Amino acid sequence: XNLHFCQLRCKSLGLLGRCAXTYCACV
Amino acid sequence: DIQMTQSPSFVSASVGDRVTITCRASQGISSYLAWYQQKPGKAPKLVIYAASTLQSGVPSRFSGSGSGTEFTLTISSLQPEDFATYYCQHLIGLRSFGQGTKLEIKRTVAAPSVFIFPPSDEQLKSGTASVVCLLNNFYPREAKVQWKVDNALQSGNSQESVTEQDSKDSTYSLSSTLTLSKADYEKHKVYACEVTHQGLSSPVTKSFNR
Amino acid sequence: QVQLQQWGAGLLKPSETLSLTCGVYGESLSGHYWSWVRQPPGKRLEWIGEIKHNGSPNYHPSLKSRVTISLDMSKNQFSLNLTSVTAADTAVYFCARRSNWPYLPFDPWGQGTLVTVSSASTKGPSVFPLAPSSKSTSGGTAALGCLVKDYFPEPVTVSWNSGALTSGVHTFPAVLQSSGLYSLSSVVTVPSSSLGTQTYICNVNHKPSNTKVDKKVEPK
Amino acid sequence: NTTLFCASDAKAYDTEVHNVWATHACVPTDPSPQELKMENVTEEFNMWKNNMVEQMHTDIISLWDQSLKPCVQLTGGSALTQACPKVTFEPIPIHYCAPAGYAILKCNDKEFNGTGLCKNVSTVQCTHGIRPVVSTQLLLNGSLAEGKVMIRSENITNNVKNIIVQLNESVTINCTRPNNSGGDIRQAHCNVSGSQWNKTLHQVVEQLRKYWNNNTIIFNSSSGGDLEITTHSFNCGGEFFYCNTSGLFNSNGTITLPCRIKQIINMWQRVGQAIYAPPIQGVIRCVSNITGLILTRDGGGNSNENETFRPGGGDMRDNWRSELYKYKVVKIE
Ligand SMILES: *[C@@H]1O[C@H](CO)[C@@H](O)[C@H](O)[C@H]1NC(C)=O
Ligand SMILES: *[C@@H]1O[C@H](CO)[C@@H](O)[C@H](O)[C@H]1NC(C)=O
Ligand SMILES: *[C@@H]1O[C@H](CO)[C@@H](O)[C@H](O)[C@H]1NC(C)=O
Ligand SMILES: *[C@@H]1O[C@H](CO)[C@@H](O)[C@H](O)[C@H]1NC(C)=O
Questions:
Q1: What is the whole-number distance in angstroms between the Cα of residue D168 and the centre of ligand 1?
Q2: Which of D24, D26, D27 sits opposite B2 (nearest CB)?
Q3: Domain membership of residue C59 as a residue range
């Protein structure tokens, strides 16, 4: 993956989010 | 587990006729199916594999089609050598076979010749008496045989045996053996076997007095 | 051309081990799977197992607690072992080749080996006459025969006049009696007129007990 | 392209999730003997666009779904439930073969980057043994590099794309969960030779340079995300292990990695969450050969004497691609 929530999670670490297959990865 | 079901279970067909038999798997097996031919007393023989591909040497009158769960073996015009029991086989997994489809020769009704044989004196010395009733060269295979001792129907003390179809005249033969003790045999007088069959206008009875 | 020939002992008592072997002539065992298939009386074929290169056989589920299949590569033969046999293992056993993918169907086949499992002891057959009679002359055709009773195991062979009498002969399949011994009848139909001028003898041989009988069958 | 079969020397009686499925979906094979080689033949390859990868991905999904049933599944607010019995789980070798009218070309050049011309072509009928291993960060039970280590990417200069490393020397890893003893039944650990491992990097790093000039490389842990791709995850005996690799990625003894057994997992088969039953009792122990890694490179910053690499993965196609790169399907014409 859910890209929006992945993005919603990563910026709270200071980071952008993107999918790694079906998983959320922070950049 | 995958299960192979052949239909029909039993086919009777005349020479020259076309026949098509089917094999159904309980789950899909794509084209992983083969057909074998087996005659009584003999080993199976490969006919078709990959559903539709003939093994070298197999005559052109044979063909096969199908894929998935429904499969087909076809003979465009039967010759005498084709009558046999046919098995299908799943080529992978548990390598399970179908229950087999028996292909028998159809022919005209033929009444049985009936003969009765009393037990030999030699066998009576041993403590047992065998009475044999013979039905010779009849068709169809279905027949009823009843034993009678001093005019009284016997049950559960006789055994039957039937031959495979004769390779030439396509008739059957049958023996029925009534088994009694030595003591039992010598206390009765009349022994009779009664045969009912489609080729007879009425039941035929052969008998003797001890 | 390729031939599969089988050998091995076929008469066993319960709890013993069945051990059959199949030799291949005209081809090597290399790069081919080699398989066993059995057929209980009056039932369908059942796969036992297969193998190509030593170190990876494949067996049926219901038998893998009991079965060993192995290759003798120097003689181009392979064998089947079956431990703790019961009556339920009574069947005709076949060996068969199984070539590499996708030639997966079993082909060719051996002639099969008959395996009989029983506690019954070996016994030679008693031969009794089935005499022709005048209530047995069906329209100028008489019938006579021989009852071959109480022998074990299968099979027996029956001929008439040492193989000279062939027309009209019917040797029925053996039946297993409740005693555990086999029994069988052989009959023949002949001209009534010939009864007085032609001798009729059924010949029965059971090699396992070296029994040879020529019981002459005379009218009464 | 066309659809292929597969192959597996898997037993029919041995009831194990891989075998039972393998027995009802493959063939033993094969037509002997070897790969008929070509000479003075040039053929183009592309590991990143290879239809066999997509076909494999779909098959392994079917295996897991039929084999490892989660008790509960959550996707898009929708809940699915089914029986979830504990099972025995362990990899099996697999080959993929071509049908009647096609063939599988095999590139034999030792140093192959996955794209361009191959000068030592051949033609097998089926692929090498592939272990359908599902994992992140580390590739297990794979094939080894023929000579020295090799790296491959769709575009090395593009930081979003994963870098696939192929080792030439296996590093054995032993993970064990002791019979716990007042203890956490989910606490497990992994042991690997420190000395053995402090030489594998010493060879990968040399090759990680050269592409990026004389920059100095530093390894750091994952930057974040789902717990499954931040840690080294894999399936052992039906149980899900999660290993912290911080000590493994901190630029002559033993490395001890702490582990956790989890019952709640984010699916790789689909975007969603699934729950499996609690762990079985007794010792759970798996020995595997580490044969590769999946890396992503930290971009953004200039050549600050560092590019920095962190563990990645997630798209299991990358696991399949790492083994299937040297194959291609062709039409006879
Ligand atoms: C493996 O590769 C390294 C460098 O990448 C090299 O030093 C080593 O000799 C190789 N080992 C083998 C067995 O080829
Ligand atoms: C690879 O990435 C580099 C850097 O972003 C870019 O200059 C180059 O065009 C890319 N190659 C492609 C997209 O084929
Ligand atoms: C892994 O261990 C390091 C060591 O302190 C820790 O900082 C990090 O948070 C851990 N990551 C986990 C448990 O995901
Ligand atoms: C790798 O293979 C070994 C032996 O074949 C097996 O014990 C182990 O579980 C496998 N590893 C994985 C992650 O499947």
A1: 6
A2: D24
A3: 1-119
